[PDB]
Amino acid sequence: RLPKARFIAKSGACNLAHKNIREQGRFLQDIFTTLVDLKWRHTLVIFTMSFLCSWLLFAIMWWLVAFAHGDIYAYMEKGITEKSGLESAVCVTNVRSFTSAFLFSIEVQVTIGFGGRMMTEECPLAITVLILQNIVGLIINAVMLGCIFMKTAQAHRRAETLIFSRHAVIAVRNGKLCFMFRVGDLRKSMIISASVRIQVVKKTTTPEGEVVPIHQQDIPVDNPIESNNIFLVAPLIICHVIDKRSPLYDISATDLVNQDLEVIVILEGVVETTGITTQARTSYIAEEIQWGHRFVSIVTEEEGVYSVDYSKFGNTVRVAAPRCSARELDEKPSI
Amino acid sequence: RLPKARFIAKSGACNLAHKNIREQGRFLQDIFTTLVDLKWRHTLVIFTMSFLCSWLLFAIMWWLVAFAHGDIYAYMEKGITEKSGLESAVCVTNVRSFTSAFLFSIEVQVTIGFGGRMMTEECPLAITVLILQNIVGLIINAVMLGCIFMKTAQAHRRAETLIFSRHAVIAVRNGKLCFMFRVGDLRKSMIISASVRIQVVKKTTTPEGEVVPIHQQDIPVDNPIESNNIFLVAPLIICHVIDKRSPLYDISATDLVNQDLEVIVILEGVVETTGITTQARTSYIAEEIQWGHRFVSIVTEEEGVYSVDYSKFGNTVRVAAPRCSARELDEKPSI
Amino acid sequence: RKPRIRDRLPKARFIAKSGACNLAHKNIREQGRFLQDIFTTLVDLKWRHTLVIFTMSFLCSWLLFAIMWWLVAFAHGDIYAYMEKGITEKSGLESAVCVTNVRSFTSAFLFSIEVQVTIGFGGRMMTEECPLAITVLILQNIVGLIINAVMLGCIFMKTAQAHRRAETLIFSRHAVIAVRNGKLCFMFRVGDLRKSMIISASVRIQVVKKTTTPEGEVVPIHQQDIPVDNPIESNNIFLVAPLIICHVIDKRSPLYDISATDLVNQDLEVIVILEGVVETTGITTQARTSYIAEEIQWGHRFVSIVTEEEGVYSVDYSKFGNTVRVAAPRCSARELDEKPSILIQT
Amino acid sequence: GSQSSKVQIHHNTWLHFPGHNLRWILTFALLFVHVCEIAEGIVSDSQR
Numbered sequence A, B: 001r002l003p004k005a006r007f008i009a010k011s012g013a014c015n016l017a018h019k020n021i022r023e024q025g026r027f028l029q030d031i032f033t034t035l036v037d038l039k040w041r042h043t044l045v046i047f048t049m050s051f052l053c054s055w056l057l058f059a060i061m062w063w064l065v066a067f068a069h070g071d072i073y074a075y076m077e078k079g080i081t082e083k084s085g086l087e088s089a090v091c092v093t094n095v096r097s098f099t100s101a102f103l104f105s106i107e108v109q110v111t112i113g114f115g116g117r118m119m120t121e122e123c124p125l126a127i128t129v130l131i132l133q134n135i136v137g138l139i140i141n142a143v144m145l146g147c148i149f150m151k152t153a154q155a156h157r158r159a160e161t162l163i164f165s166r167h168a169v170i171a172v173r174n175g176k177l178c179f180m181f182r183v184g185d186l187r188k189s190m191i192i193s194a195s196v197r198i199q200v201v202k203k204t205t206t207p208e209g210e211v212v213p214i215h216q217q218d219i220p221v222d223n224p225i226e227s228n229n230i231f232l233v234a235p236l237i238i239c240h241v242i243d244k245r246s247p248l249y250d251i252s253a254t255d256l257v258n259q260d261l262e263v264i265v266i267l268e269g270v271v272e273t274t275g276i277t278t279q280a281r282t283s284y285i286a287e288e289i290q291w292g293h294r295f296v297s298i299v300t301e302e303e304g305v306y307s308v309d310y311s312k313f314g315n316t317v318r319v320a321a322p323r324c325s326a327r328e329l330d331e332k333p334s335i
Numbered sequence C: 001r002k003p004r005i006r007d008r009l010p011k012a013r014f015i016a017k018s019g020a021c022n023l024a025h026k027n028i029r030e031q032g033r034f035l036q037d038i039f040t041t042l043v044d045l046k047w048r049h050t051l052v053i054f055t056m057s058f059l060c061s062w063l064l065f066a067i068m069w070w071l072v073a074f075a076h077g078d079i080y081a082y083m084e085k086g087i088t089e090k091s092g093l094e095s096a097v098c099v100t101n102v103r104s105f106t107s108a109f110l111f112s113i114e115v116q117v118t119i120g121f122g123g124r125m126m127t128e129e130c131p132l133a134i135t136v137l138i139l140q141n142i143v144g145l146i147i148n149a150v151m152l153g154c155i156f157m158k159t160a161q162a163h164r165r166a167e168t169l170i171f172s173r174h175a176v177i178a179v180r181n182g183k184l185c186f187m188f189r190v191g192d193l194r195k196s197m198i199i200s201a202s203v204r205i206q207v208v209k210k211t212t213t214p215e216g217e218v219v220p221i222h223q224q225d226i227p228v229d230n231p232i233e234s235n236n237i238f239l240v241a242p243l244i245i246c247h248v249i250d251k252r253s254p255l256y257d258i259s260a261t262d263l264v265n266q267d268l269e270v271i272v273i274l275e276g277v278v279e280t281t282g283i284t285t286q287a288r289t290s291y292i293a294e295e296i297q298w299g300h301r302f303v304s305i306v307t308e309e310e311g312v313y314s315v316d317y318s319k320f321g322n323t324v325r326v327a328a329p330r331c332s333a334r335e336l337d338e339k340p341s342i343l344i345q346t
Numbered sequence D: 001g002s003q004s005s006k007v008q009i010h011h012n013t014w015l016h017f018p019g020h021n022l023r024w025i026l027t028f029a030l031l032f033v034h035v036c037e038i039a040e041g042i043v044s045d046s047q048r
């Protein structure tokens, strides 16, 4: 009872599955690419995690660093100043605790700098770790800043919202059959140089043995200059007539109830403000197309101005239709 | 009243009402989205307000935080000497007001850190407030920097300038009819890979009894290779010749007043200065269609250098012509 | 193939199978390499080199202006005023130490760090006496902000170009020629590895050959297009699974002359250039491959790579270039076309 | 692992047999030894 595998699921999102792909690998730089495009929830945590980590790490490099040069002991043994004058060799002035060291750490990699913890010039290793901490702080700061700007740059583009009607129809226009979906639009800006292509997916044997397993023909759509452009403000009805040249030409009234057909439709174009290319895909399997009922009018001239109504986006009514095939209807006049 | 509703208004806009659609829900991301695309008379205001609000809020927090631990009391009582302010017991050193705490907050936020307002490791809660405010300050700084840079990157994207005409002229040209109009350009740049499209909107009722309220027919544009690209430096005269099969083939040549018609012109391109796609458009209703008049030659050699004057950009001249539709021109050789 | 062994250089390979344009330009009017060029090389470095140039630049600026500050705190008679240990610092207050508590180049360097990266430890401040020091401080901060901005721009632009990883478009290493649907057909296989689709795709197939003209001219490297044989004459293509892009030739295309023996000595070379814009990046990409005469394993036919799994199709990529040598007529390019009396030369 | 070019499914044991023996037992032992050290430390700290 499983549906025979569909090439493009009804909600776009082509559901193919190719394996044995030679594992190209897992490029060392890949984490950064994954890092750039995260939910804002994460890029407001990895920020905090990176900063807090670096701070703590350099702090530990730092509380211990104060101990080694004799700093902790002078303050502790006597009074800081009442009993005695400074040893004057303190690496960073008044750096009392592995708490105080942590506090000091915040000044170097965050560029605040209070002043009560100066850097003397005796201990060279201290100068080395100062250079290193400052460089790391700058690199981390710049990388995080670039990430935050990328995820504030891409706040304009959100998502493809191009809506095809649920299922197709098949009717007669000017004494000949047709095939209709109903494309449409949602947001303010029109699409630019929007284009439409209709492909039929089928299993084609060949009179010379070859049997293309899942083979995709392209078929023309209807337009009085045979051009695939389009310009949509209210939903259109993009027909694509069937004729002797067309492949659907052998479909039948009964056979469509159990048939191997797959009419994918693709629509391309850009969006004016964002200036970004985009495309949208969808389909029509044999179960989904029901013959003889044309779609229902939308545009209504209100008193003031035209009105486009969505209440009946996919509504259908039956209409006269002959049950023969495409080649049958044109087979003979008397036919 | 009785104004038949135009599909798209003469001054470059789309005016068809969006009705009855479901509410997708104003997602929270939209707020940031609308922050990004603001004109500069609001961006600096929101910028400043955000900075001031953060400053003041954290200053109030520090004042409270130098309240519960009783720093504030201690500074006040010991006026004469202060005994080194009880050996700097207070969590934040030398803060002993609100305004002073405000100065401390400004120092910590904007990375100044004067020094009189040193911070000790005496109490933990102060460290927690410092870390919190620091990280929030960095996030606000990064966000606002991103905003300003996004605005900077869109300096070139300014507005749209394409000079159409208020008059379509149907005068004879090379032994047939035409429906010309004038297309101009103001900016010094040349639109790369421009295209033109002409569409006709009118109500129609299909032979099989289905009615289509509006219906975009297309019409070809004349070009000696049937190519819709174009090279617009000077004003140009688009002309959509009326062959036998064109929709305008049965106009009431001089009873063209009560006619349910509209012509739409759409020009697409990408500007070679930015790279952004762009599109201009307009429409001609019946009442704005001069008959018999042809457009007026403009291009004039002046002193051996070509001159183009827009003073006479869109003014026409009446010139005698046949008054019968092309069909009334197709029946007999001399009709 | 000893003749080919000595003929390894003589070879009609206009574009290497990798894709580059193996050519040689010369006698050109190289105006020079203006300054801004170097800056562009700064953008397109790799991470190890960018990090090195970054850190080296910061350290060089710090050390240089520290040396300058050292000279400054020398000339103002400051180091001596400190060195006078009659007291802890007996007359070091009135002498207007140009920079407070600057004792030796190490200390001056600590001050340089403290003034460029906006740390500011306070223990050593500029004073109200020496205008020269104020001039050098202004210069320090201006150069600091410019260098900071430029390095930030570099790092950012190496971050914003993280979408680009590598072009991954795959061809059948070999061509194939066969008979399909009653007539001779030229084939090739095209597949993709990236999950993302390729919008507005297009392909073009061109023949590169040395030509002759009846008028007398010869065009050395002549290019001529060929149709891509889609159902409704359009160079569009949907790429979910890999497929077979067949440019079948009748008369107008230059395949009428082909004789099976001639392929070894054949001079024509097929070039394929396809292009499209990637959906999730916004970049227009273009991939090119070369089909040399030595790689055209005539007479074969391609294999099938689509199988019904449980509910979802499975696809292989190992069997790309594997072919089953289905029997086909020989040299029928003109014989079958210019139909003999039988009109069925096959 | 949220964006890469590999077999998407999660199924592997590349060099696990000489490493499973290593980690799975080693870390546990190690975690055991760290627990032991925690015990000695806690009781000693109470003593001192």
Ligand SMILES: Nc1ncnc2c1ncn2[C@@H]1O[C@H](COP(=O)(O)OP(=O)(O)OP(=O)(O)O)[C@@H](O)[C@H]1O
Binding pocket: A163, A164, A165, A166, A167, A310, A313, A314, A315, B021, B022
């Ligand atoms: N108001 C609407 N806004 C957006 N999409 C719509 C709307 N109405 C219908 N659709 C589209 O119709 C498709 C299927 O709709 P659904 O099956 O939920 O309702 P239906 O009435 O059973 O089907 P249909 O609406 O197509 O007749 C969906 O892809 C959806 O995008």
Ligand SMILES: Nc1ncnc2c1ncn2[C@@H]1O[C@H](COP(=O)(O)OP(=O)(O)OP(=O)(O)O)[C@@H](O)[C@H]1O
Binding pocket: B163, B164, B165, B166, B167, B186, B310, B311, B313, B314, B315
């Ligand atoms: N000098 C000009 N430069 C650019 N565009 C022009 C110029 N003159 C007219 N146009 C455009 O032509 C269109 C209509 O021209 P029309 O023949 O109606 O003259 P008009 O509109 O009365 O002139 P105006 O717009 O100055 O009142 C207008 O939309 C206008 O933008």
Ligand SMILES: Nc1ncnc2c1ncn2[C@@H]1O[C@H](COP(=O)(O)OP(=O)(O)OP(=O)(O)O)[C@@H](O)[C@H]1O
Binding pocket: A020, A021, A022, C170, C171, C172, C173, C174, C316, C317, C318, C319, C320, C321, C322
């Ligand atoms: N599963 C796959 N993974 C990676 N590359 C592939 C795969 N299948 C085919 N190719 C590529 O297709 C090209 C030609 O493949 P061909 O049809 O010759 O199969 P092949 O004989 O196995 O190729 P090769 O000899 O290069 O391994 C090769 O360059 C190869 O890179």
Ligand SMILES: [K+]
Binding pocket: A153, C160
């Ligand atoms: K970008």
